[PDB]
Amino acid sequence: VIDLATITKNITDAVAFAKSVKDVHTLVKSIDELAKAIGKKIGANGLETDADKNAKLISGAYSVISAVDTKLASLEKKVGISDDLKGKITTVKNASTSFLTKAKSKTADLGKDDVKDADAKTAIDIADTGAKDKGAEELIKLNTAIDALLTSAEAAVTAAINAL
Amino acid sequence: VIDLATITKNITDAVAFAKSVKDVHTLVKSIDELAKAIGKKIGANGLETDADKNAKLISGAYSVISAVDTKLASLEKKVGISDDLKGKITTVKNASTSFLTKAKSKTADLGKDDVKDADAKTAIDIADTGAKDKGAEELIKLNTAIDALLTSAEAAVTAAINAL
Numbered sequence: 001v002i003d004l005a006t007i008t009k010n011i012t013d014a015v016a017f018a019k020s021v022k023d024v025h026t027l028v029k030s031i032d033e034l035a036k037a038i039g040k041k042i043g044a045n046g047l048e049t050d051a052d053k054n055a056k057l058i059s060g061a062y063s064v065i066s067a068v069d070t071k072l073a074s075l076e077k078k079v080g081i082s083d084d085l086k087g088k089i090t091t092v093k094n095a096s097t098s099f100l101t102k103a104k105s106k107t108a109d110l111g112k113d114d115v116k117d118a119d120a121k122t123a124i125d126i127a128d129t130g131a132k133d134k135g136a137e138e139l140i141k142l143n144t145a146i147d148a149l150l151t152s153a154e155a156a157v158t159a160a161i162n163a164l
Numbered sequence: 165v166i167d168l169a170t171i172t173k174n175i176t177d178a179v180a181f182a183k184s185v186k187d188v189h190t191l192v193k194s195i196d197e198l199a200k201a202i203g204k205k206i207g208a209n210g211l212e213t214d215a216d217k218n219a220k221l222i223s224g225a226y227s228v229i230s231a232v233d234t235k236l237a238s239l240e241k242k243v244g245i246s247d248d249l250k251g252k253i254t255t256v257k258n259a260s261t262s263f264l265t266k267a268k269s270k271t272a273d274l275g276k277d278d279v280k281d282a283d284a285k286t287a288i289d290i291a292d293t294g295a296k297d298k299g300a301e302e303l304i305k306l307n308t309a310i311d312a313l314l315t316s317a318e319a320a321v322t323a324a325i326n327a328l
């Protein structure tokens with residue numbers, strides 16, 4: 001009296017799902033690395049200060065969240081996910097779309113020839129002490145939503161290993 | 165007479181190692197998203213063309229690979245890793261150190277007030293049909309090295325679940 005095939009499939013499934021979620025979490029976290037580059041140039045010894053001219057960096061962030069967005073779109077579709085987890089996915093996807101919509105709507109500010117440090121922070125820096133009025137707020141919401149989904153996905157992996 | 169607990173620990177350890185590896189592969193792949201942004205502004209409908217002024221975007225990529233490099237430096241140190249995997253990690257960390265070294269070395273090209281698209285491509289765009297002479301070559305190497313590490317890491321997870 002025991003049971004292995006079903007338990008094995010359950011760990012495989014839960015791990016496969018966590019993989020997709022983890023990949024999305026990494027991408028979102030990575031905007032924090034891009035924010036460190038606001039107003040920075042590559043110099044002889046690493047990043048040094050060279051304020052402003054940030055547009056293409058924000059474009060980078062936008063490109064990354066685009067990929068997040070596309071990945072979640074595809075996750076939303078996976079078969080055999082619990083209603084629960086599908087909901088947590090939708091919350092992330094909504095947050096991601098939100099960020100992209102906000103950024104687009106601030107084209108005049110974020111796409112101009114010289115986006116100043118302050119404004120770049122309002123788009124992509126979650127520790128921004130300024131207004132978070134050009135993406136940052138939406139980025140915080142995304143971070144909260146993906147942290148929730150990842151917590152759930154990893155919980156399932158743990159449960160599937162210990163139900164062993 | 166199989167030892168549920170040793171099998172369980174091995175799944176857990178292999179999965180935690182893959183988690184770290186996977187997070188590094190995603191950070192490296194993300195450079196491909198950033199490259200899509202070279203010479204693009206955020207516009208009312210998404211990225212649109214706005215040539216050049218790419219320095220801060222390259223800084224972004226630089227920042228991201230710093231994070232990769234740091235993560236691998238920590239991985240290198242994990243206890244209980246097989247010599248084989250350790251070697252596979254070293255190949256990745258070497259490649260990321262290489263990238264940062266090359267970028268730094270091309271400061272006069274990459275940190276100037278107007279880095280043109282072509283140049284940006286030679287740093288951070290692995291499908292660049294131009295020279296790969298300011299980072300791209302090293303980024304391609306990094307890509308190969310982490311793909312190999314990831315393949316190994318994921319193989320171990322599947323072995324660990326299958327050994328079950």
Ligand code: NI
Nearest residue numbers: 050051276277
């Ligand atoms: Ni300057």
Ligand code: NI
Nearest residue numbers: 025029143147
């Ligand atoms: Ni997070």
Ligand code: NI
Nearest residue numbers: 113214215217
């Ligand atoms: Ni322009």
Ligand code: NI
Nearest residue numbers: 189193307311
């Ligand atoms: Ni790859």
